[PDB]
Amino acid sequence: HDSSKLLWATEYIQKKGKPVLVNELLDYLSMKKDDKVIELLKKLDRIEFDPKKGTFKYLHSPSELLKLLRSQVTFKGISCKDLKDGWPQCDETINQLEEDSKILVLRTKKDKTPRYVWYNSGGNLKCIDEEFVKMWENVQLPQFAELPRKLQDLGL
Amino acid sequence: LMLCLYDKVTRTKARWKCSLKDGVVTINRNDYTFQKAQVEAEWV
Amino acid sequence: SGIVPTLQNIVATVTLGCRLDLKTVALHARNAEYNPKRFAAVIMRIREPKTTALIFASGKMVVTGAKSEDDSKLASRKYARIIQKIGFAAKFTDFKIQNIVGSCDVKFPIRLEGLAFSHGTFSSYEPELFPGLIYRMVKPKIVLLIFVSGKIVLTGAKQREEIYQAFEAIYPVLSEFRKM
Amino acid sequence: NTQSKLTVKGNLDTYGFCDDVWTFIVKNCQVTVESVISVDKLRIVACNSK
Amino acid sequence: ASILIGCRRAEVARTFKEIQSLIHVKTKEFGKTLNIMKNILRGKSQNLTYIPRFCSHLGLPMQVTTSAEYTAKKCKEIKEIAGKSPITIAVVSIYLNILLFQIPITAAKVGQTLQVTEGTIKSGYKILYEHRDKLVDP
């Protein structure tokens, strides 16, 4: 079919994943021997077609990650689907680029911590021990407008 | 070449008893059509 | 004493350095067994030494049935020659001893009850499941079997020297609990 | 329409198991029919009927 | 196996089948994990009682057991490890005593009560018929 040939060629181009001659593209899967696939490559982004030499590519750094993280300011939250495909082992970069240099959203330790769009000043700030964090939880923020007097009682 | 079907072959590391059913045996230009054959072979 | 452990079973590992087609190996070799859905290793055997091999498509070869390092090595080399005879670029390398099983007979009956009771740390004993006693030496880390019939079976060693050391250290136990 | 029973008693030379196909090549083997045929070259090719 | 550890500690014991059929755990990992319990027991620290219970279900007088016990004692000491899992020859101690007396409890009835194959019964009986010469107490 017209769509089946395009789907198979796109997967085959994805399976090949390398820029090679368009002539070899047809013989790799023995299906894209008609002009329909070549026109589909120029018309669809699944197969990259350009006037240059035979080459099909995908249609990469923590610096780009930070800019991409900054690219989602006051917007929806993105996933690392493009980040890891556009930069393999992008989860490691999050661990390496700590101190907010690469923020993430670790869903759990059973799904490779699927991250989300996040930017921060400190990010981790691990040096504050949980004892300070526990006493932060142990101290409960008090009730209503008596509190402005309460901090006045403490001298504020 | 005995192009038959096996049922149950018993062996302890030195001997073969090959059950054969619904097949043929070709010896001396005369085919042996058998219901059940047990090839009690021996291993070197 | 004067009784040396008699080696029973040597299990080894061999890497041929090239991937193998176990179907072609089974077909070409006159002495080879392979079941794809029972165990994905060719059970290739020779009579000298009388050994069993676990020949995998990845090239791993587990040689068992030998009773020494050199017999296992020669069996592995013969199996590698069988492999290279077909046309696979096998290479006899990375030969390693995995398990060495030795046996010996102190020839006198032992008091297994006192041996078990005194050696709860070192001896494993359940006469109703197996009337032989399992002795676990730490130096060397060897497992030893102890029976009333006097037979002692030592297994799992990386070296037959470990088996000999285990029997030399356990012979005082065998003679100490010898019933006369 | 098969009634014969065969009992091949000889010396197996080569064997092989692939695609659940057993190839038993016996040399100087005697097969007992129901008369026993002492046949030198026999190749038992056993295929899975299950 | 805790019950086995319990009952044995309770100074009685029942055959594994009487417990394995009581609680089916395929008997393989059951015993294997059972053994380490003794090792844990030692780390945290016997057919002689099977005698009267066996004759109990068959309803006989009291003097059988000690007469059987005398026979049971003689087998193992000289030779005849006799069983490799020697639970089998526990009955062999008994049957050559019921062969002595005229009450018909032939291995047909023992085989359905004590559940021993006559392959073990007849073999154990006859190899103990060889040494029964030294076994005349009264």
Add this chain to the structure above:
Amino acid sequence: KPMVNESDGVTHALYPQEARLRNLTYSSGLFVDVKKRTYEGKVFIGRLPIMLRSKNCYLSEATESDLYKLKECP
């Protein structure tokens, strides 16, 4: 009829005199035939204490001399 399953597991007829001395309970077992069915023999269920001199007790109709033998006052 009344009996007792002793420590080893042996089960023998129990006599009332023994019951009092050995702190036993003069009971007897119950057994029911069970029929099991799958749709598209005898089963023990428990014991039962028995009234002394009841129809089922060993002392049901024993002789006076026999009672003396069993050490139970007529």
Add this chain to the structure above:
Amino acid sequence: RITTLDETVGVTMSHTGMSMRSDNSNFLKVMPKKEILDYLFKLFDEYDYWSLKGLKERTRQPEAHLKECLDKVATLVKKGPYAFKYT
């Protein structure tokens, strides 16, 4: 009325204990990828609601070969009303 059990207490107890006999009365006793892909392409096209396990059940092919066959020319949907359907 009740039938007295003259048979001794042990023998009446015999069946009721561990006699090592049960079940006397029966009661509650208790590959090639292209051809597979060709099978998957045929199974998906011929039957829109062709189960992947059903394709393994119909083509009599291994689940590893049948599942890998669907990833090329067949649709593998695991959620929604069209669950486990190859088209």
